[PDB]
């Protein structure tokens, strides 16, 4: 019964961390995906200004949105994915020792 309560507690936690991982990967797609078109929208009006110290900054600001896009999206893959692999690894391992328990029964 001790073991049952304790390892049921880890599993619930591990299951909760898993549905967080799914949301966290999903919600990097936009702003990142949005800013990939924010960059083109700004860049577009930057062909319309030609006056050097407004054209120049505006193209840099465009570039800035692309920068935000590249980093924000990369972070699904950086961090969330590292955790999703080890979270998944644990749930299986917990499954497997559920079999060892059964063997004892």
């Amino acid at each position: 019964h001790d073991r049952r309560v304790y390892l049921d507690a880890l599993e619930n936690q591990l299951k909760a961390l898993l549905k967080a991982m799914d949301n966290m990967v999903a919600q990097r797609k936009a702003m990142a995906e949005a800013a990939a078109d924010f960059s083109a929208s700004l860049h577009a009006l930057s062909t319309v200004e030609l006056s050097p110290t407004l054209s120049g900054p505006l193209d840099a600001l465009s570039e800035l949105q692309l920068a935000i896009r590249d980093v924000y999206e990369r972070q699904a893959q950086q961090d969330v994915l590292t955790f999703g692999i080890i979270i998944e690894e644990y749930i299986r391992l917990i499954g497997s020792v559920k079999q060892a328990f059964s063997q004892r029964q």
């Binding site: 200004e49 006056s51 407004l54 900054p57 505006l58 600001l61 800035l64």
Partner: protein, 55 residues
């Protein structure tokens, strides 16, 4: 009427040109506010890491 269209348009150019300059100043301050807070918040993670690296 045609005359007014030109000077409304000259105004509009000045308006655009002003507007964009503001939008940078807006983003730049916002960025700075972030830059400062973000450097400390992460500095703090690194300090936390040292404390708990040395165990």
């Amino acid at each position: 009427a045609r005359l007014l269209f030109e000077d409304m348009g000259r105004l509009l150019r000045s308006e655009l040109d002003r507007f964009e300059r503001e939008k940078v100043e807006d983003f730049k301050s916002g960025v700075e506010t972030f830059l400062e807070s973000a450097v400390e918040a992460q500095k703090e993670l690194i300090e936390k890491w040292e404390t708990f690296l040395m165990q």
